From Swiss-Prot, chain B:
It comes from the Viruses. This is Portal protein. Transmembrane segments: none annotated. It comes from Bacteroides phage crAss001. Homododecamer. Interacts with the Cargo protein 1. Interacts with the major capsid protein. It is found in: Virion. Forms the portal vertex of the capsid. Probably involved in head assembly, genome packaging, tail attachment, and genome ejection.
From Swiss-Prot, chain C:
Displays an HK-97-like fold with an insertion domain that protrudes at the capsid surface. Signal peptide: none annotated. It is found in: Virion. Interacts with the auxiliary capsid protein (via FD region). Interacts with the head fiber dimeric protein. Interacts with the head fiber trimeric protein. Interacts with the portal vertex auxiliary protein. Capsid protein self-assembles to form an icosahedral capsid, with a T=9 symmetry, about 77 nm in diameter. Each asymmetric capsid nonamer is covered by 9 capsid auxiliary protein, 1 copy of the trimeric head fiber protein and 2 copies of the dimeric head fiber protein. This is Major capsid protein. The chain holds residues 455 to 504 of 504 of the full protein. The lineage of its organism: Viruses, Duplodnaviria, Heunggongvirae, Uroviricota, Caudoviricetes.
Swiss-Prot record, chains E, I:
Its main location: virion. The keyword Flavoprotein does not apply. The central region FD is structurally similar to Helicobacter pylori flagellar cap protein FliD. The keyword Protein biosynthesis does not apply. This is Auxiliary capsid protein. Interacts (via FD region) with the major capsid protein. It is found in: Virion. Auxiliary capsid protein that forms an outer layer on the major capsid protein protrusions. Keywords: Capsid decoration protein, Capsid protein, Virion. GO terms for cellular component: viral capsid, decoration. It comes from the Viruses. Residues 75-237 are annotated as: FD. It comes from Bacteroides phage crAss001.
Length: 151, 46, 31, 101, 333, 40, 50, 50, 333, 50, 101, 50, 50
């Protein structure tokens, strides 16, 4: 196996201790949805009607606090059903419940299939009105990992 | 462990020169030389 | 003693990112 | 020579015997645990490993593209297949099946 | 598991509910104390190193108070049922290669640009039926996916017998087609797994997937051979790895922010949450407003966890003790 | 080159004594050593 | 999400917005500084070597 | 159309050093974390708001 | 803590007994396995991450196998009866300073030269009897040795009434002179106390002491005042901390030699022993010799710990699982 | 044998005779080495600048 | 048979394996067999006490331990501390051909 | 018992709390075997805050 | 009087560097512990044998 093994280079260590190094990943996330609720707390089913009709507010339960106040987030169908978040995240244990409403002039609301478990949600922007407005949006950070090996 | 002799002269300090002597006292009485015999063999001949 | 020649060595091979190695193995060499 | 083959089979064709709790599973003669690490072929087989029964270019091309569609730039998509001797004639007679269609 | 805060957040594990300050003896005890004028609420708790108090909630300055049950924090593992497509052919056509591509989206990173793909391939025979196809497909899937030399278990594979129609027949890399003896298979369930976890260092995250197909030539036309729909989830991830992660963060607002870092020279925080038990979580959220000009609020919160066995007996007693002392109307789960 | 401290090492020596300096054995096969007259 | 090997200690972690000291302590970016010149030798009259 | 952003930091993060148990990353525009050797915490807040 | 070994030691916690390799389901179980030819003994224990076997003991090469109860691993806390020497003076004399010195011998180090000297003193007055003396000295020591400012618990001091003569009335620095209300005090007992314990960083240790008395002038000659006899112990420190510090050591033979060194990067080995429970210990000490000219033996030992419920139920059932399977006579305890 | 300050979590430790690697780890003198030249970037085609 | 990293036996008609070598069957690297002790010679056969090495908490299948399965030597691992002698070295012999005038 | 003692040690000198220290290791003159061992130690540390 | 001593170590401790979490000390002959800065383990064994 000498022709196979010597095709690879070598590396010198100080001792026979197990050794580790740095592992760097990536940053661009979108949060999967856990459930969607109407304005009274009843969870939207897969066979339910349209949710948030006439720009009526509804809730959007995510497993992390990721989006902020006044930010526009989109489902699997980006820019077709944009949701505007009306406030900070209300914690439900570890879950984060944003009371959202639509941001596209949509009168008929979002279908119930685009509000189910496993739908990716990214951030778009945080718009305001041109006068007298107050602060919206926030920022996010990440971290790396590591890996070992043996002798 | 003999200390590293691949150093600049500023890193051959008071404790480095002392560590070379504490090695010769402690470790080596080895008498493993390829062309010369052992000390009990010469002492019998004397 | 018996005349035994002993030899010993340490080693180890590190694969940093195993996502950059692809293998197609025939199905008779598994399980 | 046959201790060179020990270090050539331990580097390449070796395996690991540890838990997910860090415990070793095998103990030597003097009570201490025989510590082993995985070789080449047990570390590179944790990802991108597929087990086929019959080789086809429907499978290899669509697995090498999806690895290169998400990870590699278009200029940097050269894959040097390393195989045996009869794996070269299995790649010869299968491209010839693809080309003849 | 690092979380986000409005401002500071403090967690107290409720292992046993007492009624008096002098009865707080066991590590994990709690008594919700208040006045008779109902103007201040706080939680005297027993640490492993003595009795501690919480922050003094002004009961006029409470914003919301809701308690989350354990089954609301259970992650429903998604399943995908792979069948043969009826419009292409209900019976596997002979000589065509049936290759399935599982498309993973978050392989080692936090983002979808880090993807991963595992395959399974079956060439059909002349006398191969539909049930014999799912026998050889799911053996060919489990041979690629669930090997013993893999890094993490990604998906679990399950067949469905058509007569039973409710019991999963599991296939592993060691599973042989001699053991799969049923003659009526109608779908192959691919179901994601529980990723590993150590508290504070590795969060509870998941790798989602989608089974995708390649094309086959049935009548000279390139059709993809199957359909893969998402059925309802049948298994739940328990709450224990999330709350033992949640205590590890909120035991740094109280005590040490340096956990373990200069390792022999540390303060070691002892946690009273067992990761092998589900929990009911109550988060009472409140603030403080200053005297004259400090009208800006300091929005903080106090988290309380309590284990249930089946019916929620411990948290509904804790909500009943907070209500009868402070005078709120927290809803009972 | 001998510090005044090093002279006091020479000058604090108990007395006198006076080819058995002392014996080392490397690669010993065994533990059983026999001595009472002064040779091992 | 997942692991590069059998032995991978850490998972990728993330947060949003207000970063506190436990937000920086739990991502292992906060450590106590070793006081090097400060050193306590225990006071005793040692009657070894006598 | 008009937009807005905000981010609040604590007071003691003026010259907050990072002790680098794991190497501190900085999310680039391309979606790739890069290793950064800058020790202060405000070097990573001022990049992210940008 | 760190212990000495005869060339290895490995520990297996015996939390439950299953007697077959197929029933190993939860963490910490044990099965002592042996074949019908009585030559090989090994223990298949279900670790928290899979089934792990032991070193294969060759039963012709065992040396000793003796099992120890948990009442033999309890360090008894010694007592010291401080009294007035009645040959010196039956009643305290109205002028002298009655000072008692406690000579601690291992205060923060390990050596007898790291000492500590703590005191208590009574100025005896006219008409002060012995019971008013012992009431006035146990407070004068509790302000010193059982105060809330002290770094470590040094001793636990008590008083004994002559009518009761068996129960102790404990005196603390907060105990007033009206709390001790008895006219029949006759001794002052100073007892060793349990020092702190950290799992692996701070072992279980004790600080010993001797009450020594200062000289008073009686008649015209300076005599000693007291006498201090060693009363048999009544309080014993349990076995919870000596076995947790033993398991934490012996998991590193089969596992990582470093325990937490470098904390982004540790392997969390889960420990199974409870420090709040008492344990029985069985040691099988054996060796290895090959059928060759290499006749030197390599000694090994295996420690099996199991929970005691007072009647040694789990250990005597574990011994009976080893004796019938292996054919050794481990004595039931 | 007790504590001198409040946060003396370490205790004085001692043993006899043969010392293994495990005796060198229980006294916190063995640590995993960091191969500093070894640094990996997880392979992807990032399209954040796209 | 190797359900809990439990010993079992492998009978070979020649004494070709050694004291502590890890051998593999027809499936290499998935079922590593560490030999415990020397071979007991049952006449011309030789039986090796054998346990599993590479983390096997399920054991080999009984189909992978039938008559006719060829075994190959990989290497001979030990632990880091207080290790003892393992392994051996094998040789080969030549046969002669012939011609006449 | 060394020293030529024949009548034994009194039982009141073998009680709990009797302290035993290391004197030396005397061996026979002809065909002695190895005795004695070697004893080690390790220190502690302290801490403060602001 | 004839005396004897013996220490046994494992073979892997030939060049075993000490990653000093706590500082490694030598026992003095006077009874004191002195902090040492050497990193190889057999420097500390061979102190204690003499």
């Amino acid at each position: 196996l000498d022709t196979f093994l010597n095709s690879f280079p070598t590396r010198e260590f100080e001792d026979d201790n197990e050794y580790y190094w740095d592992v760097i990943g990536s940053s661009r996330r979108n949060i999967p949805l856990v459930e969607a609720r109407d304005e009274n707390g009843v969870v939207v089913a897969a066979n339910a009607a349209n949710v948030g009709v006439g720009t009526s507010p509804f809730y959007l339960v995510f497993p992390e606090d990721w989006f902020a106040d006044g930010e526009v987030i989109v489902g699997n169908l980006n820019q077709v059903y944009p949701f505007r978040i009306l406030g900070d995240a209300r914690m439900e244990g570890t879950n984060a419940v944003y009371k959202v409403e639509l941001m596209g002039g949509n009168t008929q609301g979002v279908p119930a299939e685009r509000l189910q478990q496993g739908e990716r949600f990214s951030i778009e922007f945080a718009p305001v009105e041109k006068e007298l407005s107050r602060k919206v949006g926030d920022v996010r950070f990440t971290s790396p990992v590591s890996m070992r090996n043996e002798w | 462990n003999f200390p590293r002799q691949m150093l600049p002269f500023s890193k051959k300090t008071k404790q480095w020169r002392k560590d070379c002597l504490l090695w010769a006292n402690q470790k080596t009485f080895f008498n493993y030389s390829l062309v010369r015999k052992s000390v009990i063999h010469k002492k019998i001949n004397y | 003693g018996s005349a035994v020649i002993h030899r010993m060595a340490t080693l180890g091979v590190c694969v940093l990112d195993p996502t950059r190695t692809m293998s197609l193995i025939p199905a008779i060499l598994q399980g | 020579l046959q201790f060179d083959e020990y270090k050539n089979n331990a580097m390449a064709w070796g395996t690991s015997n540890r838990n997910l709790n860090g415990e070793y599973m095998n103990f030597g003669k003097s009570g201490n645990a025989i510590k082993t690490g995985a070789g080449i072929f047990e570390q590179t087989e944790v990802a991108n490993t597929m087990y086929y029964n019959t080789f086809s270019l429907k499978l290899l091309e669509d697995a090498l593209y999806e690895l290169s569609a998400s990870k590699l730039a278009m200029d940097d998509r050269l894959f040097v297949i390393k195989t045996g001797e009869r794996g070269a004639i299995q790649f010869h007679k299968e491209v010839l099946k693809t080309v003849s269609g | 598991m690092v979380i986000s805060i409005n401002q500071v957040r403090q967690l107290y594990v409720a292992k046993a509910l007492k009624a008096n300050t002098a009865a707080l003896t066991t590590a994990g005890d709690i008594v919700p104390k208040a006045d008779t004028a109902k103007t201040t609420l706080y939680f005297q708790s027993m640490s492993p190193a003595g009795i501690v108090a919480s922050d003094k909630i002004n009961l006029k300055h409470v914003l919301y108070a809701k308690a989350t049950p354990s089954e609301a924090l259970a992650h429903k593992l998604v399943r995908y049922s792979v069948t043969l497509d009826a419009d292409v052919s209900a019976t596997p056509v002979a000589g065509q290669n049936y290759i399935l591509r599982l498309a993973f989206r978050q392989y080692i990173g936090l983002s979808e640009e880090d993807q991963y793909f595992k395959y399974g391939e079956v060439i059909a025979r002349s006398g191969m039926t539909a049930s014999d196809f799912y026998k050889k497909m799911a053996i060919s899937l489990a041979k690629n996916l669930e090997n013993k030399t893999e890094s993490t278990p990604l998906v679990n594979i399950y067949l469905i017998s058509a007569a039973a129609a409710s019991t999963d027949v599991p296939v592993t890399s060691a599973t042989k087609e001699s053991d799969l003896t049923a003659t009526d298979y109608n779908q192959i369930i691919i179901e994601e797994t529980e990723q590993p976890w150590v508290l504070g260092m590795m969060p509870q995250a998941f790798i989602p997937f989608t089974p995708q197909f390649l094309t086959i030539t049935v009548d000279g036309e390139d059709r993809l051979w199957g359909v893969a729909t998402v059925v309802t989830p049948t298994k739940t991830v328990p709450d224990g790895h999330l709350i033992a992660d949640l205590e590890y963060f909120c035991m740094g607002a109280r005590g040490d922010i340096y956990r373990g870092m200069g390792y022999p020279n540390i303060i070691k925080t002892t946690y009273l949450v067992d990761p092998g038990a589900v929990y009911d979580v109550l988060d009472i959220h409140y603030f403080y407003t200053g005297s004259n000009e400090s009208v800006q609020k300091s929005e903080k919160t106090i988290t309380l966890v309590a284990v249930d066995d089946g019916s929620h007996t411990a948290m509904n007693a804790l909500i009943g003790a907070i209500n009868t002392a402070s005078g709120l109307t927290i809803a009972t789960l | 080159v001998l510090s005044p401290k090093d002279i006091k090492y020479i000058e604090t020596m108990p007395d006198y004594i006076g080819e058995r300096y002392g014996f080392v054995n490397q690669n010993m096969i065994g533990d059983e050593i026999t001595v009472r007259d002064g040779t091992y | 999400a997942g692991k590069l090997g059998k032995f991978q200690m850490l998972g990728f972690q993330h947060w949003k917005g207000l970063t506190s000291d436990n937000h920086l302590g739990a991502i292992f970016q906060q450590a106590p500084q070793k006081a090097t010149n400060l050193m306590v030798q225990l006071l005793a009259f040692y009657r070894g070597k006598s | 159309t008009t937009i807005r952003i905000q981010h609040k930091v604590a007071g003691n993060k003026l010259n907050k050093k990072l002790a680098m148990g794991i190497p501190m990353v900085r999310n680039l525009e391309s979606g790739k974390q890069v290793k950064d050797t800058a020790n202060m915490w405000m070097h990573y807040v001022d990049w992210e708001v940008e």
